[PDB]
PDB file of N, CA and C in Angstrom:
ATOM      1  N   UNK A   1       2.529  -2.579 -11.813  1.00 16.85           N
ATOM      2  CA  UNK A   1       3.971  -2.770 -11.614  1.00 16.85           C
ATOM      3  C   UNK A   1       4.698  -3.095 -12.904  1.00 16.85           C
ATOM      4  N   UNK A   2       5.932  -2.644 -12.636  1.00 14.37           N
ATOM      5  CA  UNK A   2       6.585  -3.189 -14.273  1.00 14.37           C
ATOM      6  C   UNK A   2       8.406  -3.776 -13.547  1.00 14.37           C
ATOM      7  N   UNK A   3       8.826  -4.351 -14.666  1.00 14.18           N
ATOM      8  CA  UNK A   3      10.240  -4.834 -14.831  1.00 14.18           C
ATOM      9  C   UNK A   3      11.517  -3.843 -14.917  1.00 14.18           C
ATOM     10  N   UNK A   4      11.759  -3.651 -14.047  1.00 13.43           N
ATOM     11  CA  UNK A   4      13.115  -2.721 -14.615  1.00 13.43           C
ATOM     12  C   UNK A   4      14.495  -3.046 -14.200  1.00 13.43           C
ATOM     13  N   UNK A   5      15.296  -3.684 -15.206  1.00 14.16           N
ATOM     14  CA  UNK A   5      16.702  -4.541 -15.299  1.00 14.16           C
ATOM     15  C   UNK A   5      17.765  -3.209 -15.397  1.00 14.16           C
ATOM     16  N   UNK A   6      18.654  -3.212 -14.423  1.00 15.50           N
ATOM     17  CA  UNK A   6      19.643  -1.999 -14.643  1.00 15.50           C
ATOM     18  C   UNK A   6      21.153  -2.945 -14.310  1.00 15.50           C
ATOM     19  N   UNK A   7      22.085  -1.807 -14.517  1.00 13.67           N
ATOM     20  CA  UNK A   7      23.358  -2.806 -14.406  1.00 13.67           C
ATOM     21  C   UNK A   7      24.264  -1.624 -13.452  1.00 13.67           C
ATOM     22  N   UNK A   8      25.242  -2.524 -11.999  1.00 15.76           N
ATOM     23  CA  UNK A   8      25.773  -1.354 -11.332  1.00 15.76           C
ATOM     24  C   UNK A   8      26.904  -1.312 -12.108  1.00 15.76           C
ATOM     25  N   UNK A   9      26.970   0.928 -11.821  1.00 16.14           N
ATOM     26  CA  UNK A   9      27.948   1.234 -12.304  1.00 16.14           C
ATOM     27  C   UNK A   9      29.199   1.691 -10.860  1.00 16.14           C
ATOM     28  N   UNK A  10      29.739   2.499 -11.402  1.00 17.05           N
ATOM     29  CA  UNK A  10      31.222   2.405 -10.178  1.00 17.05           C
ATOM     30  C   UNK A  10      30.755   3.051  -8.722  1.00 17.05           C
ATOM     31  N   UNK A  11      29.585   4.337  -8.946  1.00 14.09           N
ATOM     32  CA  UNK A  11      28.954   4.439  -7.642  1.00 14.09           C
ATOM     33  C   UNK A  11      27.729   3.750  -7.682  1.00 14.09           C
ATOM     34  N   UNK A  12      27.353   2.549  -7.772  1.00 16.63           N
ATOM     35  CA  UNK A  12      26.196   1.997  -7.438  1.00 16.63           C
ATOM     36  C   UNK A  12      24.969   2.266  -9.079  1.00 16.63           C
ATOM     37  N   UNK A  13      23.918   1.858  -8.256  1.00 15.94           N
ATOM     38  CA  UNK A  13      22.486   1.874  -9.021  1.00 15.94           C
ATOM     39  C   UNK A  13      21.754   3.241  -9.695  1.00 15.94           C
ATOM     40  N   UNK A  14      22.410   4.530  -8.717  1.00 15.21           N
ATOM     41  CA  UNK A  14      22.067   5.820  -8.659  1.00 15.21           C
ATOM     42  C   UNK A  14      20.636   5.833  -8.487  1.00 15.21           C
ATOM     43  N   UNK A  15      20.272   5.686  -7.237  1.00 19.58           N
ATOM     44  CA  UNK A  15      19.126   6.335  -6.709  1.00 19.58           C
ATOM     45  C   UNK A  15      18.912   6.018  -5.399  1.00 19.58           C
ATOM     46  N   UNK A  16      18.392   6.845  -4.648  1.00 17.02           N
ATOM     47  CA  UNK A  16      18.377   6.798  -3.584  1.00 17.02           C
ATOM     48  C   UNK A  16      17.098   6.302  -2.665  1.00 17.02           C
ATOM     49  N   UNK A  17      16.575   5.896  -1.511  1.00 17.20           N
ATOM     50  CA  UNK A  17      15.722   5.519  -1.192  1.00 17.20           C
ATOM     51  C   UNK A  17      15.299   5.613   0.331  1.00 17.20           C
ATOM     52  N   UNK A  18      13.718   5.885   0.546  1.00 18.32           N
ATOM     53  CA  UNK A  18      13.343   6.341   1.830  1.00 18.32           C
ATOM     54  C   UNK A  18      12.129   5.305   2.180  1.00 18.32           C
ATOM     55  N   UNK A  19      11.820   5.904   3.560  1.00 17.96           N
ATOM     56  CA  UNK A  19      11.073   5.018   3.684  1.00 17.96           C
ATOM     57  C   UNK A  19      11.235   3.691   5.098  1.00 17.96           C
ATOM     58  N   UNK A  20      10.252   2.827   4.606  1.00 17.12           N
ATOM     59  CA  UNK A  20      10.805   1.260   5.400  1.00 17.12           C
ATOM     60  C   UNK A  20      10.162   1.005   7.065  1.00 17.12           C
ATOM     61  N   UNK A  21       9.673   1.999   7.098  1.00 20.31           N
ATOM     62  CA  UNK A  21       9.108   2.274   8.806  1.00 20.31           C
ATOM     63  C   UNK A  21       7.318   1.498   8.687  1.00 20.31           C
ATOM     64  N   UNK A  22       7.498   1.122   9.606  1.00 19.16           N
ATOM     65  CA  UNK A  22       6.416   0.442  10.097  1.00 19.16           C
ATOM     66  C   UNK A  22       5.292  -0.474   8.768  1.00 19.16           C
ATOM     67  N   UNK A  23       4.435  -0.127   7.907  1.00 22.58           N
ATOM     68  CA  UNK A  23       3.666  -0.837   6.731  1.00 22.58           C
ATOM     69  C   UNK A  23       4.556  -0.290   5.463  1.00 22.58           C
ATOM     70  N   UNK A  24       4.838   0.849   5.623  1.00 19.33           N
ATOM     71  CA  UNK A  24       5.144   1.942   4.677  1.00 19.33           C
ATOM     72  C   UNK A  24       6.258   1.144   4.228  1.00 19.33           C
ATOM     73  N   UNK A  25       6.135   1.172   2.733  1.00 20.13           N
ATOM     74  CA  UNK A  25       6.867   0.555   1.591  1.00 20.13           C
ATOM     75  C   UNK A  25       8.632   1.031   1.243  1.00 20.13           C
ATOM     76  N   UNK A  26       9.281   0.732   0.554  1.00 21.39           N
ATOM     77  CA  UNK A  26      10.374   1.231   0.597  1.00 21.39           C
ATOM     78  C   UNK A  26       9.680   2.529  -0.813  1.00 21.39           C
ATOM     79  N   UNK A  27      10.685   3.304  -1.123  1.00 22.21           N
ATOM     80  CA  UNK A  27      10.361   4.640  -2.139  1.00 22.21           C
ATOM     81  C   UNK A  27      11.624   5.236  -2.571  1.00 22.21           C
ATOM     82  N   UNK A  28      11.607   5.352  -3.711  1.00 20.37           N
ATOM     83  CA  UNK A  28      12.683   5.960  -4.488  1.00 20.37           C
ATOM     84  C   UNK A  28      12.638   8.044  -4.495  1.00 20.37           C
ATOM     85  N   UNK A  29      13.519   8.004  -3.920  1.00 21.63           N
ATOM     86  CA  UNK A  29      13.668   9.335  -3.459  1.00 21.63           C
ATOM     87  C   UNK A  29      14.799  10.546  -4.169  1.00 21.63           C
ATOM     88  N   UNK A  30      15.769  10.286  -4.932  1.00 21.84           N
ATOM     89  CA  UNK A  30      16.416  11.095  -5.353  1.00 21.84           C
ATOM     90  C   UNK A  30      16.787   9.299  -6.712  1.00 21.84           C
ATOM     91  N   UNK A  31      17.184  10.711  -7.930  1.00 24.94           N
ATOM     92  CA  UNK A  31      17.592   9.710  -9.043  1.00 24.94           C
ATOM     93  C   UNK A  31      18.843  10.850  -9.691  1.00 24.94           C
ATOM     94  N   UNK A  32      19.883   9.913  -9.238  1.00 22.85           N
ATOM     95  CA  UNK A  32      21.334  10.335  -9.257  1.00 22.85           C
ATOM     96  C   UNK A  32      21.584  10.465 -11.116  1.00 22.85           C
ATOM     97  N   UNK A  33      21.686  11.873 -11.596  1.00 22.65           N
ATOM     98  CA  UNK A  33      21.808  12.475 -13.346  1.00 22.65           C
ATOM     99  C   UNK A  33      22.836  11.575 -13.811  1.00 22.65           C
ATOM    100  N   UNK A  34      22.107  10.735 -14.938  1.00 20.17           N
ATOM    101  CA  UNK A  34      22.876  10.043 -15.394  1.00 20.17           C
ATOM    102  C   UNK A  34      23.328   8.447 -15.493  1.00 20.17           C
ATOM    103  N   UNK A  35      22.708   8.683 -14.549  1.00 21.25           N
ATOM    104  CA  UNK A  35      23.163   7.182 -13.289  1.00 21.25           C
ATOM    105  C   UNK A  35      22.545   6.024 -13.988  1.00 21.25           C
ATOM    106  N   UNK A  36      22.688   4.787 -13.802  1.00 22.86           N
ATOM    107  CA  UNK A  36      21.696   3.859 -13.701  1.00 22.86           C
ATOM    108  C   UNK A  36      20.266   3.797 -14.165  1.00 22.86           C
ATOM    109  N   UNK A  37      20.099   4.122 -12.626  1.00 23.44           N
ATOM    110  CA  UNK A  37      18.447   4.120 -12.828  1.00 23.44           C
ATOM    111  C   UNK A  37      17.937   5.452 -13.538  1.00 23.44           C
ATOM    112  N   UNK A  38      18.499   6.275 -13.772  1.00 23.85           N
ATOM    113  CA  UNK A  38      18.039   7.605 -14.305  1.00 23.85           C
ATOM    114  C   UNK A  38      18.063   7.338 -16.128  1.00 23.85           C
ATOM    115  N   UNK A  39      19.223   6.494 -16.743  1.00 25.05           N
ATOM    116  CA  UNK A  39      19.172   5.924 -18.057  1.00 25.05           C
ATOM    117  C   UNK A  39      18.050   4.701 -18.219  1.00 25.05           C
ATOM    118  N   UNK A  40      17.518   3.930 -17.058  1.00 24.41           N
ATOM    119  CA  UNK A  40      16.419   3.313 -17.067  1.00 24.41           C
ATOM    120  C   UNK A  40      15.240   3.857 -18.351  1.00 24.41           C
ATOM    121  N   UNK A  41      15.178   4.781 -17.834  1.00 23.91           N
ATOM    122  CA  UNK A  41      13.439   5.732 -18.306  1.00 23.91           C
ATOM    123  C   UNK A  41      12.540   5.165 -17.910  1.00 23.91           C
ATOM    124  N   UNK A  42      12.295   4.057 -16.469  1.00 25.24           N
ATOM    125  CA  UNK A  42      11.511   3.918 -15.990  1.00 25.24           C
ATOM    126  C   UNK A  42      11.163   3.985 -14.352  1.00 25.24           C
ATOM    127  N   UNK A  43      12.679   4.040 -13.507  1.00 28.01           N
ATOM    128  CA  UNK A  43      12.663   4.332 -12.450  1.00 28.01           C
ATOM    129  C   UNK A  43      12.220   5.986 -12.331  1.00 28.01           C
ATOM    130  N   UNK A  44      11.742   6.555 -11.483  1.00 27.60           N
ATOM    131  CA  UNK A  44      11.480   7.182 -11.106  1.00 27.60           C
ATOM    132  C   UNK A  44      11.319   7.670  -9.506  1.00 27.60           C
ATOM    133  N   UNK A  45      11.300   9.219  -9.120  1.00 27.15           N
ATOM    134  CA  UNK A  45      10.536   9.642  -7.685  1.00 27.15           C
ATOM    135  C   UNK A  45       9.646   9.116  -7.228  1.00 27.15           C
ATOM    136  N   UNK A  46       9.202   8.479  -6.384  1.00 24.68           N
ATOM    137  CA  UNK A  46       7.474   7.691  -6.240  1.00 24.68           C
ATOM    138  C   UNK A  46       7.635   6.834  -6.180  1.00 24.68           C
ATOM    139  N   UNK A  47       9.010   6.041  -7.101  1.00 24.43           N
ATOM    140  CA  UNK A  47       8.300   4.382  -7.231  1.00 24.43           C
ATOM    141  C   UNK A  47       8.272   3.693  -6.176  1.00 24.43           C
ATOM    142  N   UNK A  48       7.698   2.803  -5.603  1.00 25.84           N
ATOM    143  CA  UNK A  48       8.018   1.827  -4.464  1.00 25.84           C
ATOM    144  C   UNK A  48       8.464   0.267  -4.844  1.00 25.84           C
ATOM    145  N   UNK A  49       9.146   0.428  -4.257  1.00 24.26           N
ATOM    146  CA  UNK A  49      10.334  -0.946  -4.776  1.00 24.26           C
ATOM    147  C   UNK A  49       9.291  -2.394  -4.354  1.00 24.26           C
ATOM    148  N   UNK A  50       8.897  -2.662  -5.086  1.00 21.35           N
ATOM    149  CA  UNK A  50       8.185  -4.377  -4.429  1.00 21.35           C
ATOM    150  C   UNK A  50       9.155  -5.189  -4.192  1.00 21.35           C
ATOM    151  N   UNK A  51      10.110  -5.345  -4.903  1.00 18.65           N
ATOM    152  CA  UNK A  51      11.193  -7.246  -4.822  1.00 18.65           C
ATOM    153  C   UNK A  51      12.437  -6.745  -6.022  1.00 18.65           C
ATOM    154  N   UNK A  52      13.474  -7.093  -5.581  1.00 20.90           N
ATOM    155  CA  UNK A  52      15.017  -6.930  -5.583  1.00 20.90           C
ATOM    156  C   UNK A  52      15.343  -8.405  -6.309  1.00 20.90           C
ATOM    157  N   UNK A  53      15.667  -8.446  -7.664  1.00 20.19           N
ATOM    158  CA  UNK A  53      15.809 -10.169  -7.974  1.00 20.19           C
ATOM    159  C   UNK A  53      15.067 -11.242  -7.321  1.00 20.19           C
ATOM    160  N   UNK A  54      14.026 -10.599  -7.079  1.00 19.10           N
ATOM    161  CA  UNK A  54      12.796 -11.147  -6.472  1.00 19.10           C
ATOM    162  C   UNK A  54      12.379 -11.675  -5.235  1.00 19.10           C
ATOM    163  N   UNK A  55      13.390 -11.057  -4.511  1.00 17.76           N
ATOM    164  CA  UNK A  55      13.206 -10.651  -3.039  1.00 17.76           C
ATOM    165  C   UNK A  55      11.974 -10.125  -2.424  1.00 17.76           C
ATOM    166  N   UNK A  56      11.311 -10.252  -2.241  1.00 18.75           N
ATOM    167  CA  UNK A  56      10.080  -9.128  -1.456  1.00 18.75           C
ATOM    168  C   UNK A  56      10.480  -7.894  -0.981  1.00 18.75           C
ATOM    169  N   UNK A  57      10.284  -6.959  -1.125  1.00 20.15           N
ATOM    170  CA  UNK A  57      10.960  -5.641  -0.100  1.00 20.15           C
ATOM    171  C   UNK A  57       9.644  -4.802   0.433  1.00 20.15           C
ATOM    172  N   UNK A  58       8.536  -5.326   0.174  1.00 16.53           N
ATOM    173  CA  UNK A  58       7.346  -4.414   0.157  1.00 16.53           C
ATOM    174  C   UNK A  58       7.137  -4.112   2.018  1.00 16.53           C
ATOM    175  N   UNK A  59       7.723  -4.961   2.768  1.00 16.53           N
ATOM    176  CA  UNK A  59       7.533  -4.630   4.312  1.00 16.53           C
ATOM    177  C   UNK A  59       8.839  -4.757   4.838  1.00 16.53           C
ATOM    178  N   UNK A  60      10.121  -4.330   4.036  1.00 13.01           N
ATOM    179  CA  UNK A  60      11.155  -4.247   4.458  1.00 13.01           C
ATOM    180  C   UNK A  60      11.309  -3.221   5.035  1.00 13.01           C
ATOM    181  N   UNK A  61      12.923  -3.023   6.211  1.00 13.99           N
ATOM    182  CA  UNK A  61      13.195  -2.145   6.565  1.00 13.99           C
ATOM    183  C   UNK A  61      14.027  -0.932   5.879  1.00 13.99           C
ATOM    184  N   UNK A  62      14.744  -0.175   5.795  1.00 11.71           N
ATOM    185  CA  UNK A  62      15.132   0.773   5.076  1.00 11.71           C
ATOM    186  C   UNK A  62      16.192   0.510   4.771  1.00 11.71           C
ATOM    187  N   UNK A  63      17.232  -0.476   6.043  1.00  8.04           N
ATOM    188  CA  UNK A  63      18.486  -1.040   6.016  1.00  8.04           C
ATOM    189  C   UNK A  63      17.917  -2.174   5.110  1.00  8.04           C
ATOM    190  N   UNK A  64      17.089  -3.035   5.803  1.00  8.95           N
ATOM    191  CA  UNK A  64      16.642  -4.257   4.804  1.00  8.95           C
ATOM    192  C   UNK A  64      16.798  -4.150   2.870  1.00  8.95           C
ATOM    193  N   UNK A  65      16.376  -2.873   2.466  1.00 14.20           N
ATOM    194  CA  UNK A  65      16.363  -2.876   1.238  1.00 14.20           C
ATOM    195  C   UNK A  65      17.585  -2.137   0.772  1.00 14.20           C
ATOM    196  N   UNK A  66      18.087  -1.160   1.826  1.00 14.77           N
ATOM    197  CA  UNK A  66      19.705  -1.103   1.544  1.00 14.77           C
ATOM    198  C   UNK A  66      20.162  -2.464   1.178  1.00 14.77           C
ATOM    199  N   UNK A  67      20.319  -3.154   2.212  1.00 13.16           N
ATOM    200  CA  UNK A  67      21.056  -4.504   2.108  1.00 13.16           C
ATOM    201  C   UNK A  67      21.242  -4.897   0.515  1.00 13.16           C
ATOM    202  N   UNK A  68      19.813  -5.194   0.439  1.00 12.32           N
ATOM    203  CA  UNK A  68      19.296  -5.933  -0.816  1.00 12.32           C
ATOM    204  C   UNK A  68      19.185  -5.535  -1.859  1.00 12.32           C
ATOM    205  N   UNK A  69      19.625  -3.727  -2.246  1.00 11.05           N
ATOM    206  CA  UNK A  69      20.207  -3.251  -3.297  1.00 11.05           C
ATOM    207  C   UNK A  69      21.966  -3.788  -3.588  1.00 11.05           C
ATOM    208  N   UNK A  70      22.539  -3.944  -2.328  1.00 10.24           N
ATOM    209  CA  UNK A  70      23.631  -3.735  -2.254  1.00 10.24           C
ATOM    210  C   UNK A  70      24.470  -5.074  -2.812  1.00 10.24           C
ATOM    211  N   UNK A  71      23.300  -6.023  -2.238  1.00  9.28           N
ATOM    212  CA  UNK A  71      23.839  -7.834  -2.522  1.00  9.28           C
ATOM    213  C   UNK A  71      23.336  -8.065  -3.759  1.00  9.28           C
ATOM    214  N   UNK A  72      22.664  -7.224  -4.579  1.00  6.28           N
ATOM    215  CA  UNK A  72      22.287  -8.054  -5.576  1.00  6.28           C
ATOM    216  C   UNK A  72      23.051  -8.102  -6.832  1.00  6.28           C
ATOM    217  N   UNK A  73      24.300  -7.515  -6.869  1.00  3.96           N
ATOM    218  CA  UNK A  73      25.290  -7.770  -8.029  1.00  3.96           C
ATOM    219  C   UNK A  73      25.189  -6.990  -9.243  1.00  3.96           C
ATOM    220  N   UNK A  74      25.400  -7.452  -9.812  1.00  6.16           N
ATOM    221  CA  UNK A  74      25.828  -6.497 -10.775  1.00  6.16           C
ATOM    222  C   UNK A  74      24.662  -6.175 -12.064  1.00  6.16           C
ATOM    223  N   UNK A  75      23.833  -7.189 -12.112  1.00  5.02           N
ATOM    224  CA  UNK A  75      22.286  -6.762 -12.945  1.00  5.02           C
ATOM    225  C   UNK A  75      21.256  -7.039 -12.026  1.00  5.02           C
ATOM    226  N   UNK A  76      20.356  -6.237 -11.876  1.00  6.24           N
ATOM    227  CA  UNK A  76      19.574  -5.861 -10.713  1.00  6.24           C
ATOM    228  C   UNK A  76      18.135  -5.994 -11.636  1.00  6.24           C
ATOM    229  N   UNK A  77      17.492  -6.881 -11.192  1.00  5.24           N
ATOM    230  CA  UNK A  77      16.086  -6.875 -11.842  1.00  5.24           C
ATOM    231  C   UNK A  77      15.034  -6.038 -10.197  1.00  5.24           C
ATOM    232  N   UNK A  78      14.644  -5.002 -10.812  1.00  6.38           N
ATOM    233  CA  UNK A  78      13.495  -4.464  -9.730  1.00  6.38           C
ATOM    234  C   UNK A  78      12.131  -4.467 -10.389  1.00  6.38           C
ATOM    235  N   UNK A  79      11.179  -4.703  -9.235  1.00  6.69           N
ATOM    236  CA  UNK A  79       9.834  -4.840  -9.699  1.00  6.69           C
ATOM    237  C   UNK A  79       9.486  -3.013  -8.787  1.00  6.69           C
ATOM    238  N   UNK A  80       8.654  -2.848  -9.852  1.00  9.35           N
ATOM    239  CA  UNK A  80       8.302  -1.401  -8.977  1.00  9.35           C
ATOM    240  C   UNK A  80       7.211  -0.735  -9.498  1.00  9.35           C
ATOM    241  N   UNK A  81       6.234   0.069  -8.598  1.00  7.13           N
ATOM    242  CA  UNK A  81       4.834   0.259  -9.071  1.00  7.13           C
ATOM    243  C   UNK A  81       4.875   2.119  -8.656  1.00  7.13           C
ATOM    244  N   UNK A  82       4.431   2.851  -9.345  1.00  5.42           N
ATOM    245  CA  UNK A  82       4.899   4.661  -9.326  1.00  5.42           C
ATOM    246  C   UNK A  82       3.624   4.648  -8.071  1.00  5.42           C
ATOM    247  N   UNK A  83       3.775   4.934  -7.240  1.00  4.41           N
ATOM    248  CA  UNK A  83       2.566   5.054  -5.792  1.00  4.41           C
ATOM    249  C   UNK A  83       2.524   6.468  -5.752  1.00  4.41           C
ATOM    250  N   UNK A  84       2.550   7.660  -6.327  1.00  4.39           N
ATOM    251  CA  UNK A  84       2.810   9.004  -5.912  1.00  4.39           C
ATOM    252  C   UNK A  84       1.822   9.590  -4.698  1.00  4.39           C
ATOM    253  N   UNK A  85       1.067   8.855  -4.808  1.00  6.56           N
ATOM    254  CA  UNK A  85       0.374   8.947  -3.354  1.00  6.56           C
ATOM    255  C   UNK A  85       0.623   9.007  -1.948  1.00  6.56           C
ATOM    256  N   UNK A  86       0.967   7.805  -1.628  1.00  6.47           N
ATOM    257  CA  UNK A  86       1.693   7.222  -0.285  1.00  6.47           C
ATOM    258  C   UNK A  86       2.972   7.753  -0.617  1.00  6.47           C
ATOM    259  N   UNK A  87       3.885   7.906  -0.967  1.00  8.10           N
ATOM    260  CA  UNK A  87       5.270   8.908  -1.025  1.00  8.10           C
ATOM    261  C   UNK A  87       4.740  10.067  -0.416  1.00  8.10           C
ATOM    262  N   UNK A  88       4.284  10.859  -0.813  1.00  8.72           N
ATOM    263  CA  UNK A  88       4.048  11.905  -0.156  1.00  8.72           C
ATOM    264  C   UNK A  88       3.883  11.964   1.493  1.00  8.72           C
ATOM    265  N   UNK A  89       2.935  11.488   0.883  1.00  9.62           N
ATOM    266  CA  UNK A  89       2.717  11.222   2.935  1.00  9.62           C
ATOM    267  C   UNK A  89       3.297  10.400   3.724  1.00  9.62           C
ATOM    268  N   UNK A  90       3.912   9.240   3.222  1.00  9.46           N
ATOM    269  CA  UNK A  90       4.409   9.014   4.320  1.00  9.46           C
ATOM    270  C   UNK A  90       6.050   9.352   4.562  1.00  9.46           C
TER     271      UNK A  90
END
């Protein structure tokens, strides 16, 4: 897992996210050109979000980690580990 500190811009974090059903982790699913997380150079497709300013999100719901992108203001520390595995499938 690694650290990745981003800051929101006027549409949000830019990236999108799936996932949240039953064990299955939250997952970064589209990375909006330009955006946020796309100037990161470390978010990526795959990643699975562990903790939101250090929230847990690893057995959240899909709204749950909506939420908790949404409340966390304006510098967003995410913990996140590239799973390209489990993305796929689930």
């Amino acid at each position: 897992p690694r650290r990745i500190v981003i800051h929101r811009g006027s549409t949000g974090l830019g990236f999108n996210i799936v996932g949240g059903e039953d064990g299955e982790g939250i997952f970064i699913s589209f990375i909006l050109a330009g955006g946020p997380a796309d100037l990161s150079g470390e978010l990526r497709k795959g990643d699975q979000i562990l903790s939101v300013n250090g929230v847990d999100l690893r057995n959240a719901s899909h709204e749950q980690a909506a939420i908790a992108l949404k409340n966390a203001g304006q510098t967003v520390t995410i913990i996140a580990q590239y799973k390209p595995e489990e993305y796929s499938r689930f």
